[PDB]
Each structure stands twice: as C-alpha cells, then as structure tokens.
Design an enzyme around this catalytic site. Structure first.
Site, PDB file in Angstrom:
ATOM      1  N   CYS A   1       5.149   2.523   7.519  1.00 11.61           N
ATOM      2  CA  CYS A   1       4.846   1.333   6.733  1.00 11.61           C
ATOM      3  C   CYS A   1       5.928   1.070   5.691  1.00 11.61           C
ATOM      4  CB  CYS A   1       3.484   1.473   6.051  1.00 11.61           C
ATOM      5  SG  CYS A   1       2.085   0.922   7.057  1.00 11.61           S
TER       6      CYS A   1
ATOM      7  N   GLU B   1      -0.048  -7.713   0.955  1.00 19.30           N
ATOM      8  CA  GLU B   1       0.652  -6.506   1.354  1.00 19.30           C
ATOM      9  C   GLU B   1       2.165  -6.608   1.254  1.00 19.30           C
ATOM     10  OE1 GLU B   1      -1.923  -3.928   1.121  1.00 19.30           O
ATOM     11  OE2 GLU B   1      -0.094  -3.306   2.147  1.00 19.30           O
TER      12      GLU B   1
ATOM     13  N   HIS C   1       0.757  -1.245   0.000  1.00 18.72           N
ATOM     14  CA  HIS C   1       0.000   0.000   0.000  1.00 18.72           C
ATOM     15  C   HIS C   1       0.791   1.301   0.000  1.00 18.72           C
ATOM     16  CE1 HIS C   1       0.489   0.392   4.415  1.00 18.72           C
ATOM     17  NE2 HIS C   1       0.160   1.656   4.208  1.00 18.72           N
TER      18      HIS C   1
END
Ligand SMILES: [Cl-]
Ligand SMILES: [Cl-]
Ligand SMILES: [Mg+2]
Ligand SMILES: [Mg+2]
Lengths: 171, 171
Positions: A129, A54, A30
């Site tokens: 992230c 992911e 993402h």
C-alpha cells in the site's frame, strides 16, 4: 521505469510513499504513522498535509529531495490506460506490476469509502500500500495514484487518487 | 445477440427490464414504478420481489413468458470480459453497446450506494437504465447485470449486479 523513477518510491510507515518533487510526497492515508511528531526529520507544523480519503499529500517547507525533478501528478488516468505499479518489497526486490486501469469512483472498501481507480493486473500484498501507479506519456512518466487495495482473489487492484470533480469519473 | 434474446428486453417503468426466464424478471431498482398495485397484470402479493441496492428481481407465481427458456444469470463477470449492453430505445431502435467490464464493487453514485460492475464502452441515456449486460459463453448467452449508471463524459458505464459475496470483488 528508470532507476531515478524507482528512487522516488520510499518506505513510509506501514507502507510506502512517492516523491513527486523535491518537496511533494504522496502516499496512502492508512499507512501514515500517527502519534509521530515529525516526518523525515521535519516537524509536523512545517508540513502542509492534505488528506482526502485514502489519498495523502505532503508539501514540505524545505526541499527534501533536491536531487529530483518535479514530475506530473494527475488524478487517475483515462479508462483503459495501462499503468505500472512500482511495488518495492522490504527485501529490496522490485516488482513492477502491469495493470489496465478502469473506472474512477468512490468505493466502499473494507468499511471505508475510497476515492480511487480500479484496474486489472496484467500479486500485491498489504505492505505494498502506497506504491505509485505510473504510466509513460511521450518520453516522461506520470504518476496518477497510490496503491490502496486489492481483491482477495482474481486480478483487481485499486489506487487512491487525489480529490477532484470531473465528468469522466462516477460522481 | 439473436432476436429471441432481444425479445427479453422489456419496457418497464421509467426504464427497462429483462426476462431471465418465464417467471424471472430483473431490472434496475430506480426504474421500478412504486404506487402501483400490480406488474404485468399480476398483484404485488403474487410476486416475490427481491431488491438489493440498485438490483431488483421479480419472481412471478405464474409463467409470464412461457415462450422463453430460462437462461443463466450470474453476478457480474470476470475482469476484462467484453459484454454487450442490449439497449432498446422508445422508438424501437436497437443499440447494442460493446463494453469491456471492470471491477465489481459498491460505488457511491449520485448519492446512492450501487453494488455493480463498471465498464468501458468500446452513448447511453437515462432512459436506458435497466438494459441487460450480456456476453456469450460457448453457444449460449449469459446476463450478468442491468444498466444503472454512466459518467457525464468519457466512456464509463455501470451495471448493477445481484447480491453475493466473493473474493474477486472489492468488498
Ligand atoms: Cl531505488
Ligand atoms: Cl424484441
Ligand atoms: Mg478494472
Ligand atoms: Mg472499466
């Protein structure tokens, strides 16, 4: 974690990525910028992009970080393994977070199914992230995941891991 | 775990159940016998059956275990909490298994989405499903889940937990 290991953590899209080797780059799906026609100056067609949930891995056809040795990338780690999340902040600050890893499984997080491994911090922010989960084995370091999620409160985090079926993971 | 606590673990369907109080019984959804018209001699209509994923709770309109005190039932426990899985075997053998709990989340296990908490054993078998996860708080015990799954190898287990939204769980 030594300086060279940290130099592998790279700002990428809305997050970060990690150079496993001169040609291999892993990050969280993402944070990958879509709409672009190239990454680090390399046309998309010259890149082998493998995305599993992911977890995203890029294999460039040209050495992007020839200064780096290849290092070991495994699918998560054994239950109880104490890893370190090599978090870099936009200011340049390094924030290595110790975490004791838990179970590997496919978890429904924020609507999406994430194949990763949770852990207990021994805080993270959205922009983190992509940060690599690493741990030392002997005199070398091993990366086994990339930051994909964290609970609102408490001390729970999750690192996405590469695809792979095994008996130690919740299938 | 004291004798009285173990007396709460009850053979039920293809697994086991746990008496939280004289009228409250919790177990794992996939062990609950369907096709039956009653449980412990009580018609289904006289029972309030609440099932959320793999977590099932029965509230009888009549005291089934008046000998028991009510005890605390919470939704999982904090990360790192060392619980004990009160496993009973068909032979009568007691097999309390120590486990350090991990993250709470909705996990895709064997095709089904399970809202529970994983943990690391400090082995279980299919027939053990329904066994209570308990831990001591002060001088009293607390139940926070029921055995719902285990990895093929390794030391990972999962206990289904009651529905509830919180900031410490992966939503
Ligand atoms: Cl650096
Ligand atoms: Cl007993
Ligand atoms: Mg954990
Ligand atoms: Mg665990």
């Amino acid at each position: 974690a030594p300086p060279t290991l940290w130099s592998r953590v790279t700002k990428f899209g809305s997050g970060w990525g990690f150079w496993v080797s001169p040609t291999v780059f892993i990050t969280t799906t993402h944070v990958v910028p879509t709409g672009v026609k190239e990454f680090f100056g390399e046309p998309l067609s010259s890149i082998a992009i493998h995305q599993a949930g992911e977890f995203t891995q890029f294999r460039f056809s040209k050495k992007m970080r020839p200064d780096l040795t290849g290092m070991v990338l495994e699918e998560g780690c054994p239950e109880g393994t104490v890893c370190s999340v090599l978090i870099k902040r936009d200011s340049g600050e390094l924030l290595p977070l110790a975490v004791r890893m838990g179970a590997i499984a496919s978890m429904r997080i924020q609507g999406r199914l994430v194949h990763g491994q949770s852990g207990m911090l021994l805080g993270t922010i959205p922009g983190d992230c992509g940060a690599p989960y690493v741990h030392k084995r002997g005199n070398d370091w091993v990366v086994c995941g990339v930051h994909a999620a964290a609970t609102k409160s408490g001390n729970t985090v999750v690192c996405a891991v590469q695809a792979g079926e095994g008996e130690t993971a919740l299938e």
